[PDB]
Amino acid sequence: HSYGYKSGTRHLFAKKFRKHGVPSVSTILTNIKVGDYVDVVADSAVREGMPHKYYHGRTGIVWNVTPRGVGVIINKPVRTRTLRKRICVRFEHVRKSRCQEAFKAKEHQFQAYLAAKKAGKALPPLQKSSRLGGIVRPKNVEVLARRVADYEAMVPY
């Protein structure tokens, strides 16, 4: 019986086809701050500070930044509760997470609308529901039917 630290990671901790190589310069240049949402994704070409397989593909908040490492808080269910596990990884195994992108865009749009209404400018026209009825004026009208050729065709040989 075998349950190693990296047990069952043959396809998990592997590069995608024709995408091998050391991490990129953008990864080195990304600034990680305490409170940033990050995705924990293991980079198989580093093998230092690599997260345990459980935390691959989890998103959490940064609680700590060290010169070469990142502390992330990750939710982990166990029995009847979810713990807040603080994992330590090298910066190469985190990506700036986009989990709040739609919410930030929504807040930005609301500030912009507030400014426009304060200024008395023209608000954008409202989108309309596509589910409302109306007249349809067809261009081509065809008969939907089963023909002989369909049964003839879908037989092989």
Binding site: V22, T30, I32, V65
Partner: protein
């Protein structure tokens, strides 16, 4: 049996563009670009030295995701606006270009006249001032793929910048005149190489020879007038660093559209069918 079959190209992963062009060492570049993550992306500068066949390029560079940002540049092909007009790729030229880049960046940052460096070049080593009074501007040295041999001109640009007021962290171990036995530097040898005395000696020998030094011998460049020329060039640099050399048609080819290429192929097929 064939190695370069269809499967070979299907499985092939190209290197980075600058790796297969043989320009960028990406391990070294990644280590040079890296900072403490606790710095939160505070500015960091590489002093880039790239000596071409006829020119020396020295840049102060900042790494950005969109592409590197060049803050200041200096070129050894811009030195004759300061005197020196020959030997633009020797050690004295590398030193002068380094000093020019140092003075240019210190003037552009507004901290010139507050960090002067060594007014007279003595060739001795003084350890830089780093966080590791007011600290001087700090850049790290990027030699690229050049062999870091003792006496190489990349460290000549390094020394020129250091004498110009930079804080480029270095040890004297690769300056010309460093003896690896005693573990010590002969500052006079470095001084002589800085002011070009080796070039003057070789030129004197070549004159006594009676192809080398042809543009030298086309002018009346006596070996004894080299050192003063380099000193005066240093002074002219310290005077005015903004100085430089005094100062639509198209040769692009029309690529033919895909339909035109298809017409060409169809015509060739028609011709070969008729001919046979």
């Amino acid at each position: 049996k064939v190695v370069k079959n269809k499967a070979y190209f299907k499985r092939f992963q190209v290197k980075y563009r600058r790796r297969r062009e043989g320009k960028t060492d990406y391990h070294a570049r990644r280590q040079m670009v890296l900072q403490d993550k606790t710095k939160f992306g505070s500015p960091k500068y590489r002093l880039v030295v790239r000596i071409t066949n006829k020119d020396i390029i020295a840049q102060i560079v900042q790494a950005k995701i969109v592409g590197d940002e060049v803050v200041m540049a200096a070129y050894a092909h811009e030195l004759p606006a300061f005197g020196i007009e020959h030997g633009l790729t020797n050690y004295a030229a590398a030193y002068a270009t380094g000093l020019l880049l140092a003075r240019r960046t210190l003037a552009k940052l507004g901290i010139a006249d507050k960090f002067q460096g060594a007014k007279e070049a003595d060739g001795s080593y003084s350890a830089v001032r780093t966080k590791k009074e007011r600290f001087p501007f700090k850049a790290i040295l990027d030699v690229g793929l050049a062999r870091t041999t003792t006496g190489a001109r990349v460290f000549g640009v390094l020394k020129g910048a250091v004498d110009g007021g930079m804080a480029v962290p270095h040890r004297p171990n690769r300056f010309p005149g460093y003896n690896k036995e005693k573990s010590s530097l002969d500052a006079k040898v470095h001084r002589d190489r800085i002011f070009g005395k080796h070039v003057a000696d070789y030129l004197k020998q070549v004159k006594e020879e009676a192809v080398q030094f042809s543009k030298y011998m086309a002018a009346k460049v006596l070996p004894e007038s080299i050192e003063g020329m380099y000193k005066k060039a240093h002074a002219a640099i310290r005077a005015d660093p903004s100085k430089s050399l005094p100062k639509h048609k198209s040769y692009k080819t029309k690529k033919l559209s895909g339909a035109e290429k298809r017409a060409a192929a169809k015509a060739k097929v028609a011709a070969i069918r008729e001919r046979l």
